[PDB]
Amino acid sequence: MISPERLRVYRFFASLTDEQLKDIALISEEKSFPTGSVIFKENSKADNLMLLLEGGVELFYSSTVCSVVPGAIFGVSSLIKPYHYTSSARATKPVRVVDINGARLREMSENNQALGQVLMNNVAAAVLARLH
Amino acid sequence: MISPERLRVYRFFASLTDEQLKDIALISEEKSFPTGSVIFKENSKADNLMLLLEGGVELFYSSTVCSVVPGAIFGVSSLIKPYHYTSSARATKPVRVVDINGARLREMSENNQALGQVLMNNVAAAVLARLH
Structure with a gap:
């Protein structure tokens, strides 16, 4: 489904490395x-x-x-x-979403410190932006 | 100033280990x-x-x-x-706060993966709770 150069245009994903985007696409x-x-x-x-x-x-x-x-x-x-x-x-x-496997993100966050750090930063930024 | 068993009663700090609370107190x-x-x-x-x-x-x-x-x-x-x-x-x-050295938290987050993970989780939870 997810053709992950397309993910880069969105804030949450724009900072990820190419490998990280391919990895997230695989579970999306x-x-x-x-x-x-x-x-x-x-x-x-x-x-x-x-x-x-x-x-x-x-x-x-x-x-x-x-x-x-x-x-x-x-x-x-x-x-x-x-x-x-x-x-x-x-x-x-009518809604379309990218649906990402959260159990997988949690594993990847645990096993890959680099991805874990960026994902948590970006989640925090996303929720902060809800009041702006 | 900060007499860090007192920090435990607050959500952001309640989950930290004793060493982590002493460490944060030192920079607060x-x-x-x-x-x-x-x-x-x-x-x-x-x-x-x-x-x-x-x-x-x-x-x-x-x-x-x-x-x-x-x-x-x-x-x-x-x-x-x-x-x-x-x-x-x-x-x-009239306001009283615990003022925590953010530059130090950033260093500690970088050098101590365990503290970095909990701090980011807790920041994310804190900002999420602003809409609840």
Whole structure:
């Protein structure tokens, strides 16, 4: 699915080495969700990190927490202990995402200090940017 | 200043080992700021990570971005590349903080993979919690 020079245009991925992008692409898949679908649920194991390519996502409690627009990541608890979603996510328009295997990212972060450092930095930057 | 069993009651520090807390205490100092003081400025090198002990802080552009209450951290770009404050901070009431040397945290993060991992996780969790 994921043809990873395309990933570089997005902030979260723009700083990664070529090998790192190929590696992340291998564990990623393009996915679509229809308007109103619940993409993931609060309290579930965070096994998917997503990059929004098209459409709109609301992070909410089943009160809205946050609205996501294309180019931004969500499912960030896939890389933040204790790795359970702190909110649910739903599509507010037809949605396409890059769906990244969070269990794999966690392994790779543990075994590859360099990738672990950049991923955590970038997650932190992404969540910081939600209030800007 | 910082008598570091006291640090454990706060979320950011509660998970650290005893050695890690002693180490962070060594590079920390209790500081006070009066109402209306600008604690740090947008675009400055992020050389101070702060834990709010008492009072109130507004993160703003010179529009408000975020309000901080006791028990929460701010100055998070001290650990997020490229390490420049993304907003200014001002006291909205009389403020006391734990002021942590960000340059030292960065060194320690680089030289001690274990501390680096926990600090980045905890920074990410802290910024995530701002929308909850």
